[PDB]
């Protein structure tokens, strides 16, 4: 046998014998990388230099017997010299071309199977569909996406075990495949890889690529699924979007997530409409997910989601009135709740702002290996009855119910290193973070939750923190039922004008209020096909496109604002912006801005095009009279309140006077043509409700005053007010 003969020869040589005998297998990892050569600091230069010499390539010694030393032209394909630091010999590129020309051919039917990922890229690009290219003010946000979806059912370790089985069955070790998915994929791969001469290392690397999920932080603007990320360069550009639909099958999870995102955006946008039901219907009939119409995916996609359910109700489809959480499908059998954000301090001394649900409510929990009935109040688990098949399932159900309760002891039970912001400092979902932390370890949570006296409740034995069943004592409000209690029914519902879903009896099942406020990213690119293409985009895109639309239509917007501002405010183009405006402050902001616009109209001159551009979107909502003074207007953006400053320049809304160009969130929105009627002349008169800005202060009418308390002035008097970025200015209460 060749290899044993080589081993005998190596043992024959004294120095190689000493190396082989002395060095251990552990020490091999160190001496394997033993190299005198150093990494080339500028490989491009070295490569350019070495392509001029005769023999820059190195090949295995066997080349000398399987390639002639020279071709018919006499050019030496290879030489006798031995490559430095190895037994390989020197070779010219001519040798490689000769091998590709008249070399020994073999079978390559296996290559597509082992390089499955690359040929899948080829195939799904072949069957992709190209739509029109649309030139739009693209706003790409940097976020983690997946480049290699991997085999989701199999974690990285399972993928490694399968790779060892398939490629190196003898070197597996003690590992045994348990997950059925492992067995099936190992089987198919072994059958496919039969008599594969390709190097086992390459097969292992390709299998690692195919199976192990890999993610990457990339600036994206469409779907974040792999089928869309790999073609990201082709699809999304700086100023254009290429409507592309990759061919082949699409993971059901990605379509479900994208449908949820689209439904959330549509309902959130449709709430601020004058006819929310009709608007929602129009965005449903005009939206497409992954190249598929959104109208016909709801009737075939049972994904449970209050937004998806509202959309289904709008089309007459029976809803479930359920929602996923922690892997369990929750159906609210009875009770009602209202969302409200509230700040909590965790057990690890970290401060969180979690969305608490005020109100008593009762849920039915359905899981893959568990089922429970829960009743909770505001941050209080009134009762929980679990019916898990095994202790692990019971523990999972109990932990999920515990976290879902949002109880203070739950929050205070956090211990160790738990971070609620990723490495990009993006705010994570606190509920998901708590679920992950407690599923990793729940000893502290059960210890700090409490124990309740339990009587001999028939078929409802209590459970203790150590997971052993008990009769007299149990976790507070937690019981375990052995009746295997085990909802899916789709009840037909009627949805009113304002998207309030009521069953036959008339109780409000779903309302837009309980729709999640998070602004997630779709897995599959979502395309909207109305006149204003940006209705269902993220916050930044909506802001930029709203201001860009105002700029473009500025010629008509000016005249409409001067002679008929009520219709300008009605303009639907501002509704998505209002969707970003917080619901509580919408009316007050609209009233304040409308009053400022009216005073600007009344006062001769003092016209400010940039100010109108800045404040016009906020005027869409119905006015709400108030005396409060606004230093900035707030808009929701990915859970952050962006403050648009009424007076001055702020990063959210910028007007570069040198270029006369307006940039929103760092994205250019266009330039404002010079308006001879502007005539700012220092005085603005469109900053404070009922006040006129004289200009720089003069330290005779008063030292300084604050914006809010400035309302003390009665009429006519002049005073200095601290408004803006530390720029005290003189003001006066308008005559009327």
């Amino acid at each position: 046998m060749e290899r044993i003969k080589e081993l005998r020869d190596l043992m024959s040589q004294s120095r190689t014998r000493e190396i082989l005998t002395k060095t251990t297998v552990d020490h091999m990892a160190i001496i394997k990388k033993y190299t005198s050569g150093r990494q080339e600091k500028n490989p491009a230069l070295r490569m350019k230099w070495m392509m001029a010499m005769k023999y820059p390539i190195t090949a295995d010694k066997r080349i000398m017997e399987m390639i002639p030393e020279r071709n018919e032209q006499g050019q030496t394909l290879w030489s006798k010299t031995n490559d430095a630091g190895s037994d390989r010999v020197m070779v010219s590129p001519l040798a490689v071309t000769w091998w590709n020309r008249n070399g020994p051919t073999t079978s390559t039917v296996h290559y597509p199977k082992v390089y499955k990922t690359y040929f899948e890229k080829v195939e799904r690009l072949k069957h992709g569909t190209f739509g029109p290219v649309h030139f739009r003010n693209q706003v790409k946000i940097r976020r983690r996406v997946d480049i290699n979806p991997g085999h989701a059912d199999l974690s990285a370790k399972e993928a490694q075990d399968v790779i060892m089985e398939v490629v190196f069955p003898n070197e597996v070790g003690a590992r045994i495949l348990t997950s059925e998915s492992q067995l099936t994929i190992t089987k198919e791969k072994k059958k496919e890889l039969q008599d594969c001469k390709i190097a086992p290392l390459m097969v292992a690397y390709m299998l690692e690529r195919e199976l192990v999920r890999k993610t990457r932080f990339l600036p994206v603007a469409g779907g974040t699924s792999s089928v869309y990320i790999e073609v990201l360069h082709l699809t999304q550009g700086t100023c254009w979007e290429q409507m592309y639909t990759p061919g082949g099958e699409v993971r059901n999870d990605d379509v479900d997530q994208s449908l949820i995102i689209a439904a959330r955006n549509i309902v959130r946008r449709a709430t601020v409409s004058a006819d929310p039901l009709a608007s929602l219907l129009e965005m449903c009939h005009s939206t497409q997910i992954g190249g598929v119409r959104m109208v016909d995916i709801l009737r075939q996609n049972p994904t449970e989601e209050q937004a998806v359910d509202i959309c289904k109700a709008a089309m007459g489809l029976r809803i479930s009135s359920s929602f996923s959480f922690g892997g369990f499908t929750f159906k609210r059998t009875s009770g009602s709740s209202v969302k409200r954000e509230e700040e909590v301090l965790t057990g690890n001394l970290q401060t969180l702002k979690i969305r608490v649900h005020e109100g008593y409510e009762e849920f039915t929990m359905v899981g893959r290996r568990a089922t429970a009935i829960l009743r909770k109040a505001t941050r209080r688990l009134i009762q929980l009855i679990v019916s898990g098949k095994d202790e692990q399932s019971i523990a999972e159900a109990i932990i999920v119910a515990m976290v879902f309760s949002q109880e203070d002891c739950m929050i205070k039970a956090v211990r160790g290193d738990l971070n609620f912001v990723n490495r990009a400092n993006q705010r994570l979902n606190p509920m998901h973070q708590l679920l992950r932390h407690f599923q990793k370890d729940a000893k502290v949570l059960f210890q700090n939750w409490g124990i309740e006296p339990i009587d001999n409740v028939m078929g409802m034995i209590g459970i203790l923190p150590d997971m052993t069943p008990s009769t007299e004592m149990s976790l507070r409000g937690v019981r375990v039922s052995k009746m295997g209690v085990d909802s899916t029914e789709r009840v037909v519902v009627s949805i009113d004008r304002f998207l309030r879903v009521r069953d036959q009896r008339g109780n409000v099942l779903l309302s837009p209020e309980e729709v999640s406020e998070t602004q997630g990213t779709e897995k599959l690119t979502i395309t909207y096909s109305s006149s204003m293409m940006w209705e269902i985009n993220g916050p930044e895109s909506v802001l930029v496109n709203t201001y860009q639309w105002i700029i473009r239509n500025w010629e008509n917007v000016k005249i409409q604002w001067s002679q008929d501002p009520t219709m300008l405010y009605n303009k639907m183009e501002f509704e998505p912006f209002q969707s970003l405006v917080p619901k509580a402050a919408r009316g007050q902001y609209s009233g304040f801005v409308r009053v400022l616009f009216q005073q600007m109209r009344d006062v001769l001159g003092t016209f400010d095009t940039v100010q109108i551009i800045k404040l016009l979107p906020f005027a869409a909502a119905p006015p709400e009279q108030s005396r409060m003074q606004f230093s900035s207007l707030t808009v929701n953006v990915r859970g952050s309140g962006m403050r648009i400053v009424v007076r001055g320049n702020s990063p959210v809304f910028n007007y570069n006077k040198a270029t006369k160009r307006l940039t929103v969130l760092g994205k250019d929105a266009g330039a404002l043509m010079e308006d001879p009627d502007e005539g700012t002349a220092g005085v603005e008169s469109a900053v404070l409700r009922g006040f006129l800005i004289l200009g720089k202060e003069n330290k005779r009418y008063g030292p300084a005053l604050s914006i809010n308390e400035l309302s003390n002035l009665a009429k006519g008097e002049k005073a200095n007010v601290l408004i803006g970025q530390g720029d005290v200015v003189l003001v006066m209460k308008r005559k009327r």
């Binding site: 922690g326 893959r368 692990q392 932990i399 599923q439 000893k443 059960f446």
Partner: peptide, 17 residues
């Protein structure tokens, strides 16, 4: 029968010992 539509988080629990 009983099935989970979408299960986030790592799952399991170290309390069981």
């Amino acid at each position: 029968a009983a099935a989970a539509a979408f299960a986030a988080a790592g799952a399991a629990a170290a309390a069981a010992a």
